[PDB]
Amino acid sequence: ESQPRQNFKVETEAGINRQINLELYACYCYQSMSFYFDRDDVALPGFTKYFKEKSDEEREHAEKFMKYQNKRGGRIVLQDVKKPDRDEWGTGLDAMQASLSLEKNVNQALLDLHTVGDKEGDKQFMDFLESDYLEEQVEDIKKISDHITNLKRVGSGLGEYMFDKKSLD
Amino acid sequence: ESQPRQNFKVETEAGINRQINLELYACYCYQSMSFYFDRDDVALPGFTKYFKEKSDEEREHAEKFMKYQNKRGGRIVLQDVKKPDRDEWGTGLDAMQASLSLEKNVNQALLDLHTVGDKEGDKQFMDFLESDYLEEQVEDIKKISDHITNLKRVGSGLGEYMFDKKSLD
Amino acid sequence: ESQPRQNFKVETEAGINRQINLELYACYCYQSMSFYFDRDDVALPGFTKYFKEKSDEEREHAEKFMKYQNKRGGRIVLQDVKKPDRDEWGTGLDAMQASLSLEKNVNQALLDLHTVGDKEGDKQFMDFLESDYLEEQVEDIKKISDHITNLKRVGSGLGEYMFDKKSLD
Amino acid sequence: ESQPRQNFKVETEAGINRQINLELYACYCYQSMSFYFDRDDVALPGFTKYFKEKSDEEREHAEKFMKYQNKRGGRIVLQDVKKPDRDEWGTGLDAMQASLSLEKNVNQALLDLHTVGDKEGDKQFMDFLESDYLEEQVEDIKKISDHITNLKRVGSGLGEYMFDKKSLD
Numbered sequence A, B, C, D: 001e002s003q004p005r006q007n008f009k010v011e012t013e014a015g016i017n018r019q020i021n022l023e024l025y026a027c028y029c030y031q032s033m034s035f036y037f038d039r040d041d042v043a044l045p046g047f048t049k050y051f052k053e054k055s056d057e058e059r060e061h062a063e064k065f066m067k068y069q070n071k072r073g074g075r076i077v078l079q080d081v082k083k084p085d086r087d088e089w090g091t092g093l094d095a096m097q098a099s100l101s102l103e104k105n106v107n108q109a110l111l112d113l114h115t116v117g118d119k120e121g122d123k124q125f126m127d128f129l130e131s132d133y134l135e136e137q138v139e140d141i142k143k144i145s146d147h148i149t150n151l152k153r154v155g156s157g158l159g160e161y162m163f164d165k166k167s168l169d
């Protein structure tokens, strides 16, 4: 057993390694999204910047889980990060809805990972998940929902152009 | 032979003199475009400013080639700069598309001028073209393409007015 | 053909997409390396920081290629990024030698990608590769070689500990 | 019942009083360790400073539990704080390993105290323990493990001397 390991179960360790891969996958999706909106036939610089920032956030999420794995005495096992499931992301509305669905899937995986910690009695891990992940997911999912509502409100064309300027920095 | 001349062929020298005239011609077109959008029945001050800045850029391009001609020991031979091929430039979309076509023609002339340098073994001239012209053309052509996409996105009327305010300074 | 596309061949476009995946793969390897040295039974914070910075550099390399693909009018096609070929990276000397081998493989892929640009006459792309990638690879490969020499000089134990403090920030 | 008492069980109150004594005991051990390394025949000033700071931390831990006991309406009952179980702490490696074992014992007592809060439904007390104690224990246990690894890496003699200078302030 590694020196720090205490109240840290193998199932919790394995759950963290699957979550690392999922956060890396989300980071990859957002990176794809960002450079899609940098296409010359898409050309929405607010969307480009917004998904780039979201991509860096997911990379931070993954690395924080890596750091935590080490803190508790687990061992990081990396896997292929799959390519995103689309090459092209439609309109700003489509991308924002794909992003909502993505964040809700990450949130469910996090809640399932909380359930592993809870049944194993990992008090510290539950609070770590709560403080550093669950609250952020809830804020993010609310923010993206608002954006979807406004992208429906403004419509295509000028509306989408104006949303890019006024709702995304 | 002039004092500095070394590894500098007469065909390269002549190519630079044709390119000088082309850059001057581009400068003239952009100047025409700029004051077209300053017409009282057009009246788009973002477009006016944007094409004025682009005109000064092309003037700089020409003068840099003049300076280089002298650096290598060639002799500048100037020609008439023809009047632009339109007096009137349509909508903001039309002007932006005329500008894309213009920049692509300058880029092709630059690539052909690179080919002259390459076959003559003008190592320094190729790098000069690469560093000081080819990269800028690629950035510019990408920027103008983005603008064309957004001018189609926003449509005529209010859209064109909003693009003038939000995409051009 | 996309609006900006000019002197940009399909083989060059495909080469950039393979290089994107390779830079992402290098970023993943360095990220693995970094958190390996953050293990409690490895615990070298200079190595951790050094490979984290190297990981961010490779991510920048990938994104710059993504941006360039868009600049020229190509289309980004992403693939799975494979997991690194080791879970554990040995001593500081082993990791530094794995890193040298990695950078030399990236450098060879870049030189092969230069060869594609050259035979297709992509003057701008060659200079882009030269200025923004080839020079950095040469500096990096020299830096890592120096580190390997010093890690052999200092030996294991105290030597490796001292190198972590004095050669890596 | 005291004025503030609400959802605060007698078993939870008693658990806090045992934890107070344990934190005081840890503070005493670290104080012993610190002045051991201030011995003229030991003379490691980094270790001296490090364990002094750790001693003050444990004193803060105890006093925070005292303050909390009062916040909830419990009553502090103090006991003898036993003398540490060694007068002499060996090498820097020995002391660091004794410290790891100490922190893991405090962590287990904290987790057992969390279990008392959980079964009694003391929602606020669990979060207090999580936020103010469990996270710190996990960081500390990871830090001490790293130090043990490096103290094995550097070896005795010059290694131990260098660790005192470079890993402890």
Ligand SMILES: [Fe+3]
Pocket: A054, A057, A058, A103, A140
């Ligand atoms: Fe997110």
Ligand SMILES: [Fe+3]
Pocket: A126, A127, A130, D126, D127, D130
């Ligand atoms: Fe909590």
Ligand SMILES: [Fe+3]
Pocket: B054, B057, B058, B103, B140
């Ligand atoms: Fe231009």
Ligand SMILES: [Fe+3]
Pocket: B126, B127, B130, C126, C127, C130
């Ligand atoms: Fe060059």
Ligand SMILES: [Fe+3]
Pocket: C054, C057, C058, C103, C140
């Ligand atoms: Fe590198």
Ligand SMILES: [Fe+3]
Pocket: D054, D057, D058, D103, D140
């Ligand atoms: Fe402690």
